[PDB]
């Protein structure tokens, strides 16, 4: 993904403010709630039985951090997302071989969560820069190495 300096700045500035212990879990959690077939991919995570159980599940929350982790990595290596993410997908055997759409969905849910948290600071130009990144990351994580 090619980001303009203004786009880069918009992303980076707000990313520094993110609660890295919570946002990721909130995004992953709402995916499971809003798009419930996604629970199947997290069979191993235990109790995903209600909005509150989902949102309170430790492995949810933990995997959230990782979601953020992967976003940051993408941010750090935007000209080489396939480079950045081959080991990430390869350590999972087949678990990231799902439709690219669900990575798109997670990206969009992350956007909704960043809007929720940041309110008017998550302006339309800042959203637009984030959509570029979530699109790039989704594609690379779908890629199959």
């Amino acid at each position: 993904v090619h980001l303009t300096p203004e786009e880069k700045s918009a992303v980076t500035a707000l990313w520094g403010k993110v609660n890295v212990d919570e946002v990721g879990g909130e995004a992953l959690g709402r995916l499971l709630v809003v798009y419930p077939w996604t629970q199947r991919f997290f069979e191993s995570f235990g109790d995903l039985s209600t909005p509150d159980a989902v949102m309170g599940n430790p492995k949810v929350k933990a995997h959230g951090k990782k979601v953020l982790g992967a976003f940051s990595d993408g941010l750090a290596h935007l000209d080489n997302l396939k480079g950045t993410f081959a080991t990430l997908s390869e350590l999972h055997c087949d678990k990231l071989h799902v439709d690219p759409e669900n990575f798109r969905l997670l990206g969009n849910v992350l956007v909704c969560v960043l809007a929720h948290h940041f309110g008017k600071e998550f302006t339309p130009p800042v959203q637009a820069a984030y959509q570029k990144v979530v699109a790039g990351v989704a594609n690379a994580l779908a890629h199959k190495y």
Partner: protein, 140 residues
């Protein structure tokens, strides 16, 4: 089909938009135009700059169409009949673009209504806007 709880969650949330109905519609359009620049091609004749009166008015029309759908949630094919004919048959909007605007409408609600946009209401709002989108793309 939308559940009784979805209908409640939708009416409760969409009832805090309030007199911002208009402004929020505009914001969602702006967010769509900037994030998903292909969508601007349906509006090559609008001025799409920030603060545009044309985006403002159009934003109000879109918001008011949503409120009409909320108000007739059990009879949406009938209530949105004219608009489904418009977008699908008359304007030929790519069905993908409804997912994009729906996402922008969710983003706008999350940015303005942090209390109301719980995970349950987010799910309900998503289902409602997908229902609307289905109606609006049913007449190709």
């Amino acid at each position: 089909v939308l559940s009784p709880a979805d209908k409640t969650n939708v009416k409760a949330a969409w009832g805090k938009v309030g007199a911002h109905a208009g402004e929020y519609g505009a914001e969602a359009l702006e967010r769509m135009f900037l994030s998903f620049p292909t969508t601007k091609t349906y509006f090559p004749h609008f001025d799409l700059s920030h603060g545009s009166a044309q985006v403002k008015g159009h934003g109000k029309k879109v918001a008011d169409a949503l409120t009409n759908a909320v108000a007739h949630v059990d009879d949406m094919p009938n209530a949105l009949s004219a608009l489904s004919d418009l977008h699908a048959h008359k304007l030929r909007v790519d069905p993908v673009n409804f997912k994009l605007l729906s996402h922008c409408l969710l983003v706008t609600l999350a940015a303005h209504l942090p209390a109301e946009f719980t995970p349950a209401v987010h799910a309900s709002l998503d289902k409602f806007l997908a229902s609307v989108s289905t109606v609006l793309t049913s007449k190709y």
